[PDB]
Each structure stands twice: as C-alpha cells, then as structure tokens.
Design a protein around this ligand. Structure first.
Ligand SMILES: Nc1ncnc2c1ncn2[C@@H]1O[C@H](COP(=O)(O)OP(=O)(O)OP(=O)(O)O)[C@@H](O)[C@H]1O
Ligand SMILES: [Mg+2]
Lengths: 385, 51
C-alpha cells in the first residue's frame, strides 16, 4: 500500500502545481498586449480560412516563396507564413494552402503512406531462440552480429572496431534459415522491415531501381533497422517473364541494390539479413567483404542435435507413456529439421481424424513413414556409394 | 397548408449554393476532415454542427 503511496505523493504535488502554473501564465502573456494568447488562436483560423486546398510542393524557392502544384493544374508563387518551417518542407511534402490568396499556412499532417506500411511489419512472432533445436554456437555468432551492437555499442568502441555489417544465412533447405531470422527479429525490438526478394522483380521495366531505393529510404528513417531479404536467390534463378526489360533489367536492379546496401549514402544503422539457398548463384560484388562482414553456414543436424529438434516440437503435444521418442530419431537418418516439425504435425493430424487427443507411438511411426516417402533425397550423393 | 407554404418558399431554396460529394480519407484532430472531391483535389475542412 505504501509503495503506491510514495509515488502518489511525488506525482500529485509536482504535476498539479505545474497545471496551476500554466493557468496563471496564459493570463500574464495577455497583459502587455491586452489578449495575446487567446488571440493567436483566433488569428490562426482567420489566416488559414476554410477550405484549405492541398497541393504538393513542387520546388522551394529560397526567399520564403515556393511553387506548389495544386493537382487541379495552375501552379502558384505562394508565400510562406506562420505555423510551418522551411526544413519541415522538403520537395514532395504536402502543403496546406489559404484559399483566397494562396499561401503555405502549414502542414500539421501525418503524411503517412500505405507504401511504407508494406515495408513494415505488425508483429509478435512465435519464433524465439531456443525453438532452435541445437547448433548453439551458430546462434552465438548471429547474435554477436545482429542483436549485440544494439545492447552494447560500448564493446565495439572500447575495442575500437566498427560493428560488423551484414550476415548471409546459407546452407541447404530445412536448416532453419528463416527460423533464426525470426527468433532474432523477436528479441532485438528494432524496426524489422521485411522484404521477399522476388517482389524486387516487377511487371514493368525500370521500376526496379525505383522500388529498391524506396526500401532503404524507409529503413534509413526508422534507425536502427534490420532489412531482411528472404531468398535473394529467386531473382537469379527464376525469370518470371512479366518484366518487359528482360534479362537486362534484372541485372540493372542488382546494381542499385549494391549502392543502397553500402555505397556513398552514410545512412543509419542498417543490419541486413540475407537468406539464400545457394551463395554460388549470387553476384560476387553483391556478397563481397566489408559490406557482408560475417557469413554463417548451417549444414544438416547430427544424431544428438535431432534430439533437440524433437523435444521442442513434441512438447506442445499431448502424449502417451507408449511414445518412445528416441526410436523416431534412430530410424530417421539424414533428414532435415524441417522433416521432424512436419512429422509431429502429421502424427497429430492422423490423431485428429481418429477423434482423440492422444498421440500414440503408432501415429508417430505412421507419420514417420509418410514424411520419409515424400522426400526424394539428393542426386548430389549418387556419385558416392 | 404544408402544400402551399412549401411551394412558395421553395423557390428561395432553389437559389442553391450547390454541393459536392467527397469521401473521408482520414480525420485530423483540429476537427477537420480530409476529403477528396472526385475530379478535384482534396480539401482540409471543418464540420458543421449537423455532424
Ligand atoms: N535446426 C532446426 N531446429 C529446429 N527447428 C528447425 C530447425 N530446422 C528446421 N526447423 C523447423 O522447420 C521449419 C521450416 O524451416 P524454415 O522454413 O525455417 O527453413 P529454411 O532453411 O529457411 O528453408 P527454405 O529455403 O527451403 O524455405 C521451422 O519453422 C522450424 O519449425
Ligand atoms: Mg524461407
């Protein structure tokens, strides 16, 4: 009770006293004039009138005048009045115009776009570290790269190193490249912009360099930022034939992507996470040192590491004392971590058709058979015995 | 009485200033609404006492 009481006692006197102080000060402001404060309010309305016509600021002329483009078509050499600043106006900004004689009377507007919201996420992933079934060291090379300079910049200035930029998460399918990216995306709580690499080829030609440069503009504002580029492999392997600029066009999108990634900009902190399935397909300039400092590799889980993948996934499940978890690992060899997650789901699904909550050893073996048939393995290993 | 009173002053009501139809894009907290009238630019403008 008294813990609430000391806060009550500080907060009441300081705040209510301040409230009283404002009330007296509006009045005192009034005196050298005869009513200054309550008249500034009547003036603002008067100056601006109604309506206010929106324009788009076309170019700003340095003399407290501007050329605004009403979308109705006449352009105007307007004056810049009160309740605005000229470094709050940038070319492109929307302006609020006095109807009778055009003047820039302000812009209190939000000026938000749905174009930016596409870049952004709304989020609370299900993905957290330690849903990673093993490979612990690899977590503490990624976390040393992405998450750690936000927690402490102190280590990196004390050492005198520049904090590492860029990670490439590569290996085989099912090694949880997307699963790491989201586990660290939850923890950091820095604005996590997500963009899938395939959206970077469009149906127009030349829109490429334009789209790419818009990503990094959003990313730059909301500093610090992560830009996650999921499967930047897709653009090199698949040409969709929707782009009229062809093979040429896709190559040009690459080149703007190089400057926006490092370049001459001297933008904010932008870590970049790049998932890909093959790193021998991506353009070598794209991946080159000092713009991608650290390159982590994942390879297939071990006999023990598969045990970890299984505990984390069988834990949600209702179970029997007939379930021998251990014999599902020994039977299954050279299968992904993706296969173990699909195997729990497939057992539960057979169990939902039988109309019971239990998951038996038999629904697990039944499920284990069916997921192993569907994988059609590698011809990479058909050389070898 | 409603019929004859109505036709007679209806003539002054047909000295209309006009109307327009827009649509609410978003509000603002100065009690003003951003409307886009259909073949025209947007207007930041105040509500009457009718809404
Ligand atoms: N090493 C791992 N430990 C635990 N779970 C894993 C691991 N590997 C895969 N998974 C599970 O499998 C799922 C599917 O894998 P994910 O989509 O993360 O893979 P990926 O390597 O990015 O593959 P692709 O490029 O083929 O999409 C994850 O959501 C996770 O549940
Ligand atoms: Mg993926």
């Amino acid at each position: 009770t008294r813990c609430k009481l000391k806060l009550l006692r500080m907060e009441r006197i300081k705040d209510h006293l301040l409230l009283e102080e404002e009330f007296v000060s509006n009045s005192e402001i009034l005196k050298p004039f005869e009513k200054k404060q309550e008249e500034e309010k009547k003036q603002l309305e008067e100056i601006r009138g109604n309506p206010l016509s929106i324009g788009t600021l076309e170019e700003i002329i340095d003399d407290d005048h501007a050329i605004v483009t009403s979308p109705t078509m006449p352009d105007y050499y307007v004056s810049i009045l009160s309740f605005v600043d000229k470094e709050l106006l940038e070319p492109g900004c929307s302006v609020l115009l006095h109807h009778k004689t055009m003047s820039i009377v302000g812009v209190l507007q939000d000026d938000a776009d749905p174009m930016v919201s596409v870049m952004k996420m709304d989020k609370s992933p299900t993905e957290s570290y330690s849903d990673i079934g093993g490979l612990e060291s690899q977590i503490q090379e990624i976390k040393e790269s992405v998450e750690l300079p936000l927690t402490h910049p102190e280590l990196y200035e004390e050492m005198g190193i520049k904090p590492p930029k860029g990670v490439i998460l590569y290996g085989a399918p099912g090694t949880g490249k997307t699963l790491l990216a989201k586990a660290v995306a939850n923890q950091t709580s820095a604005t996590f912009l997500r963009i899938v690499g395939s959206e970077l080829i469009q149906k127009y030609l030349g829109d490429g360099p334009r789209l790419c440069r818009q990503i990094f503009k959003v990313a730059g504002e909301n500093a610090p930022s992560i830009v996650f580029i999921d499967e930047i492999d897709a653009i090199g392997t698949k040409r969709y034939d929707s782009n009229s600029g062809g093979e040429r066009e896709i190559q040009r999108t690459m080149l703007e992507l190089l400057n926006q990634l490092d370049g001459f900009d001297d933008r904010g902190d932008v870590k970049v996470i790049m998932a890909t399935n093959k790193i021998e397909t991506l353009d070598p300039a794209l991946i080159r040192p000092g713009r991608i400092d650290r390159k982590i590799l994942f390879e297939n889980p071990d006999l023990s590491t598969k045990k970890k993948i299984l505990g984390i996934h069988t834990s949600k499940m209702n179970l029997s004392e007939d379930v021998n978890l251990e014999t599902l690992v020994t039977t299954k060899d050279d299968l992904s971590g993706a296969d173990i997650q699909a195997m729990c789901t497939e057992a539960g699904l057979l169990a939902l058709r039988e109309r019971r909550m239990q998951v038996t050893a038999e629904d697990f073996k039944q499920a284990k058979e069916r997921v192993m048939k569907n994988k059609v393995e590698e011809n990479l290993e058909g050389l070898y015995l | 009485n409603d019929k004859v009173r109505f036709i007679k002053d209806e003539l002054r009501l047909l000295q209309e200033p006009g109307s327009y139809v827009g649509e609410v894009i978003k509000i603002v907290s100065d009690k003003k609404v951003l409307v886009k009238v259909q073949p025209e630019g947007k207007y930041i403008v105040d509500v009457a006492k009718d809404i």
